[PDB]
Scaffold this motif. Sequence first.
Motif, PDB file in Angstrom:
ATOM      1  N   UNK A  67       0.824  -1.199   0.000  1.00  0.00           N
ATOM      2  CA  UNK A  67       0.000   0.000   0.000  1.00  0.00           C
ATOM      3  C   UNK A  67       0.861   1.254   0.000  1.00  0.00           C
ATOM      4  N   UNK A  68       0.482   2.220  -0.836  1.00  0.00           N
ATOM      5  CA  UNK A  68       1.073   3.554  -0.830  1.00  0.00           C
ATOM      6  C   UNK A  68      -0.064   4.564  -0.722  1.00  0.00           C
ATOM      7  N   UNK A  69       0.109   5.561   0.144  1.00  0.00           N
ATOM      8  CA  UNK A  69      -0.924   6.563   0.380  1.00  0.00           C
ATOM      9  C   UNK A  69      -0.260   7.921   0.533  1.00  0.00           C
ATOM     10  N   UNK A  70      -0.667   8.882  -0.292  1.00  0.00           N
ATOM     11  CA  UNK A  70      -0.190  10.245  -0.124  1.00  0.00           C
ATOM     12  C   UNK A  70      -0.784  10.877   1.129  1.00  0.00           C
ATOM     13  N   UNK A  71      -0.064  11.854   1.671  1.00  0.00           N
ATOM     14  CA  UNK A  71      -0.529  12.592   2.827  1.00  0.00           C
ATOM     15  C   UNK A  71      -1.636  13.574   2.437  1.00  0.00           C
ATOM     16  N   UNK A  72      -2.394  14.076   3.417  1.00  0.00           N
ATOM     17  CA  UNK A  72      -3.323  15.183   3.152  1.00  0.00           C
ATOM     18  C   UNK A  72      -2.604  16.448   2.702  1.00  0.00           C
ATOM     19  N   UNK A  73      -3.408  17.447   2.341  1.00  0.00           N
ATOM     20  CA  UNK A  73      -2.895  18.713   1.835  1.00  0.00           C
ATOM     21  C   UNK A  73      -2.655  19.729   2.946  1.00  0.00           C
ATOM     22  N   UNK A 105       5.809  -4.709  12.671  1.00  0.00           N
ATOM     23  CA  UNK A 105       5.887  -6.099  13.093  1.00  0.00           C
ATOM     24  C   UNK A 105       7.287  -6.434  13.593  1.00  0.00           C
ATOM     25  N   UNK A 106       7.355  -7.453  14.452  1.00  0.00           N
ATOM     26  CA  UNK A 106       8.644  -7.888  14.980  1.00  0.00           C
ATOM     27  C   UNK A 106       9.469  -8.594  13.910  1.00  0.00           C
ATOM     28  N   UNK A 107       8.835  -9.462  13.129  1.00  0.00           N
ATOM     29  CA  UNK A 107       9.508 -10.236  12.089  1.00  0.00           C
ATOM     30  C   UNK A 107       8.719 -10.111  10.791  1.00  0.00           C
ATOM     31  N   UNK A 108       9.360 -10.250   9.625  1.00  0.00           N
ATOM     32  CA  UNK A 108       8.597 -10.317   8.380  1.00  0.00           C
ATOM     33  C   UNK A 108       7.740 -11.568   8.342  1.00  0.00           C
ATOM     34  N   UNK A 109       6.605 -11.532   7.646  1.00  0.00           N
ATOM     35  CA  UNK A 109       5.743 -12.718   7.573  1.00  0.00           C
ATOM     36  C   UNK A 109       6.379 -13.822   6.740  1.00  0.00           C
ATOM     37  N   UNK A 110       5.801 -15.015   6.865  1.00  0.00           N
ATOM     38  CA  UNK A 110       6.327 -16.185   6.180  1.00  0.00           C
ATOM     39  C   UNK A 110       6.116 -16.086   4.671  1.00  0.00           C
ATOM     40  N   UNK A 111       6.852 -16.931   3.945  1.00  0.00           N
ATOM     41  CA  UNK A 111       6.790 -16.933   2.487  1.00  0.00           C
ATOM     42  C   UNK A 111       5.425 -17.388   1.984  1.00  0.00           C
ATOM     43  N   UNK A 112       4.823 -18.366   2.660  1.00  0.00           N
ATOM     44  CA  UNK A 112       3.591 -18.997   2.203  1.00  0.00           C
ATOM     45  C   UNK A 112       2.332 -18.401   2.809  1.00  0.00           C
ATOM     46  N   UNK A 113       2.389 -17.936   4.055  1.00  0.00           N
ATOM     47  CA  UNK A 113       1.207 -17.386   4.706  1.00  0.00           C
ATOM     48  C   UNK A 113       0.818 -16.060   4.065  1.00  0.00           C
ATOM     49  N   UNK A 114      -0.458 -15.924   3.719  1.00  0.00           N
ATOM     50  CA  UNK A 114      -0.948 -14.694   3.121  1.00  0.00           C
ATOM     51  C   UNK A 114      -1.110 -13.606   4.176  1.00  0.00           C
ATOM     52  N   UNK A 115      -0.910 -12.363   3.746  1.00  0.00           N
ATOM     53  CA  UNK A 115      -1.012 -11.215   4.632  1.00  0.00           C
ATOM     54  C   UNK A 115      -1.352  -9.983   3.810  1.00  0.00           C
ATOM     55  N   UNK A 116      -2.007  -9.020   4.453  1.00  0.00           N
ATOM     56  CA  UNK A 116      -2.464  -7.811   3.788  1.00  0.00           C
ATOM     57  C   UNK A 116      -2.072  -6.599   4.618  1.00  0.00           C
ATOM     58  N   UNK A 117      -1.775  -5.502   3.924  1.00  0.00           N
ATOM     59  CA  UNK A 117      -1.436  -4.236   4.557  1.00  0.00           C
ATOM     60  C   UNK A 117      -2.173  -3.106   3.855  1.00  0.00           C
ATOM     61  N   UNK A 118      -2.694  -2.165   4.637  1.00  0.00           N
ATOM     62  CA  UNK A 118      -3.412  -1.031   4.075  1.00  0.00           C
ATOM     63  C   UNK A 118      -3.157   0.199   4.932  1.00  0.00           C
ATOM     64  N   UNK A 119      -3.234   1.369   4.297  1.00  0.00           N
ATOM     65  CA  UNK A 119      -2.948   2.642   4.940  1.00  0.00           C
ATOM     66  C   UNK A 119      -4.126   3.586   4.772  1.00  0.00           C
TER      67      UNK A 119
END
Lengths: 80, 307, 82
Positions: B113-119, B157-171
């Motif tokens: 996810x990439x999100x620009x800042x407000x104005x 997060x403390x550690x990066x997620x695993x190669x196989x486990x799915x994960x989502x990130x949003x801003x």
Amino acid sequence: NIENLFVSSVHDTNTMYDRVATFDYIPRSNNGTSLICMRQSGTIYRMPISEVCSKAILNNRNSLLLSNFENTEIDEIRVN
Amino acid sequence: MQPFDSGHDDLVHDVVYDFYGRHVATCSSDQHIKVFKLDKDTSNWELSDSWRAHDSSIVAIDWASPEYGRIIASASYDKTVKLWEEDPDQEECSGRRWNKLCTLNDSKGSLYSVKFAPAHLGLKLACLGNDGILRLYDALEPSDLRSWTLTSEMKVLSIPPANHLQSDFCLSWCPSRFSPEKLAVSALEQAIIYQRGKDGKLHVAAKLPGHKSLIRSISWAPSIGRWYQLIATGCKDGRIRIFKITEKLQSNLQVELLSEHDDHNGEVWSVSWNLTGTILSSAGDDGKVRLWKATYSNEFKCMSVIT
Amino acid sequence: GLIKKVTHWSYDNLIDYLSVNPTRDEVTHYKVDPENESDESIIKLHTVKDFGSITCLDYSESEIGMIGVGEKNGYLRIFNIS
């Protein structure tokens, strides 16, 4: 050349009837997906994949824009 | 409900409106960005430019505020953030209309996810990927929009997620010009609200409880002038959680759940607000888009359902 | 596997049949033509599936289509096909 794979998204679809042993894809028009499946009793039926909306953004003009997980086209609900 | 075909050769991952609402940019999995405009005569969407942007599938794009010019961010799985500015003196649908500006390679992970800042905060930017590290990029020089300098770097997060486990990130950014800078960050089963302290470094200010599964969309409701702020959460469960954040570490702030609807029977993929924070559009795994409004009470009730 | 021959249901010369698969999962209704030896006479009309594990079956001669279906769990699913 070597691409290190990783799982991005997992989509769950429930079959029409339970107790299925094996399945197969069906190449559809406009990049659609249907699943022909054979049960444990050998009965063969056809389970379509639902068109799940991926993104439903709104607008300043109160317009809804819909994107799908399956095909390419984008749905638009104008306010008129 | 007239549809238009974006012309991509693969899946469409993120579509965003611009500030004026007359332009959409559609990223896709065939490493292309297509920008569409609204013709005032034909009243139909038409392509403005199509160009190959990244080396992997692009999963998030975001427009910048028009006071900063026509800048389009692009986060993808090839660990690059590519910023594109429109050349006014260039041919339509040529591929050279949008000129590449920067490639932020400071992230050692495939971005989501990439999100620009407000104005009201500057020409800032936010990124999150499968590395657990939040990155902020400020364009501190108004003379040239290429010296994008990393300023904040917070680990989520403390550690990066695993190669196989799915994960989502949003801003989701807070578009309030009269409040301390806040950032709503979703990581797997955790949703954290950061805040810009007096030392110029973000700190953990408030954590949204709940979220038994993966978070697929965070949208901050536009601060229209009310005394409370709203965050819409689309979880991997059926729950469209709306949080009432009241602010009163410059200022303490409290998190209270306003509503929790199981009205989708599946994963809620995208949840998004209107201009005024009145209509909430939630898309879920049942194939139907449910609109939500508040009538006679603070609790949000359902409305028209579009399938 | 249970093939049960049912009469007094067809006004024509065809004879209705009710079939249960050997895994005891589905109930299938047929209309067989006696005058042609080829397998095209076995016309598969209807099929109702997912009946747990069927342990018995019966039919009602008074009214056409009333086919009781039993199960191991205990449910005596009585329905109509024709």
